[model samples]
Target: DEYKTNFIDLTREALSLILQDLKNNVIPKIPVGIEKRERYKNSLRLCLKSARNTQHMNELEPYLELFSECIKNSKLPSHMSLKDQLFYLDKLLENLYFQGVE
Candidate 1:
């Protein structure tokens, strides 16, 4: 029981850190005047806020799905673009969630 709770807490903290890095550093660095930049920023903010409040791994699914949808809609320019960072963070969250499960 304690171990399970610890895993959940660790996963939550890891998620918060990853999302915070993206929200504070990566997202803000997106070049100005890019179309739909506000939409992407807002979606990231929503995800960050949601992650902060999330306790269970299950609570994160909707926000992750939404993040993926936002990424798909935006269609970034280059392989080294901000989209890559977002996708990488999303993947990290997915792996962390699974790790916490077992």
Candidate 2:
């Protein structure tokens, strides 16, 4: 569970501001289109919920990286398109899925 602890600690220490923004009712409206925007908001909402409630590292682990992902890619030149946003999420998920495999 070292990964869990590491994720929890990193998320708490590094992503506090972004997490605060997330909890402060600012669902990210960065992605394009209504449906993509809604999905982005929902994902951020889920991240905020996890960030606020997860007491144990295990509970926090799953949400940690993906939550910071938006913050991580916040510097994308001009907010990016819906396809790019979803593609990044897909890319992140793909990495997580294949991690420690092969």
Candidate 3:
């Protein structure tokens, strides 16, 4: 179960903020549509594209959903650039996902 657990950890850590946004009723107001989905898909793709391992588990879908949300909420510190924020957007989401919700 190492792969499953690792993937869980990866995704769980990656989508943390959006999970909170979901629980706090923030992301729901954004209106789920193709544009929103594409944003999420691209974020997830960036996060997992370089990851050597992958999973096919069903339970992790919610975390993935959160992944999309965080990407949509992307913002960077004044010092950091957009690409920096984009790179770590999934990381914030992931970290928030495990630290905030489940």
Candidate 4:
């Protein structure tokens, strides 16, 4: 098992996969913050960081879109109002990670 363990550490590739899974699955499942906001926010931040570490454009498309949609539609986190988040996401779409709509 030592041989496998040595090779199984978090490489950039593992982080990328983590980002995709977090954005696609984990983020959506976290209940909005009104009750447990900090926990949800922490989970989100970790996922965001995972995505940010990536260096490609389209590679982050899925994570960006997930974040954008969460910002646009999620209503649980009272700190960020839906209206404000939606506006922010719209502006954020112009950020480098976005590819023109296919």
Write down the lDDT of every candidate, Cα atoms only. 0.58, 0.51, 0.46, 0.45
RMSD each, Å = 9.9, 7.2, 12.6, 12.1
Judging by TM-score against the true structure, name the best candidate: 1
Q: In candidate 1, what residue range of length 10 has the lowest lDDT sum? A: 70-79
Comparing 1 with 4 on TM-score, the higher-scoring candidate is 1
Query: For residues 1-102, what per-residue lDDT tens digits would candidate 2 score against the true structure?
Result: 359767656666544445455334333544357775565556555555555633755645544555555557653412445565556545434544465384
Candidate 2 Cα errors over 4 Å, as ranges: 1-10, 19-31, 65-102
Scored by lDDT, model 4 comes in at: 0.45
Q: What lDDT, from 0 to 1, does candidate 1 have? A: 0.58
Residue 1 in candidate 2, Cα distance off native in Å: 23
TM-score of each: 0.54, 0.43, 0.26, 0.28
- Ordered from best to worst TM-score, the candidate numbers read 1, 2, 4, 3
Clashing pairs in 3: 13-94, 13-95, 14-93, 14-94, 15-93, 15-94, 16-93, 16-94, 16-96, 16-97
Q: Flag clash pairs in model 4.
A: none
Better of 2 and 4 by lDDT: 2
Q: Candidate 3: where is the Cα deviation over 4 Å? A: 1-4, 25-56, 62-102
* Residue 96 Cα positional deviation in candidate 4, in Å, after optimal superposition: 22
Model 3 lDDT per residue over 10-97, tens place? 6655554333433233323334576754655554454443332344445456546534634455621222344543444445456545
Local accuracy of candidate 1 as per-residue lDDT tens digits, 5-100: 776666566556656666677666766556545655665576667677645578776545534543455432233466676565455556556756
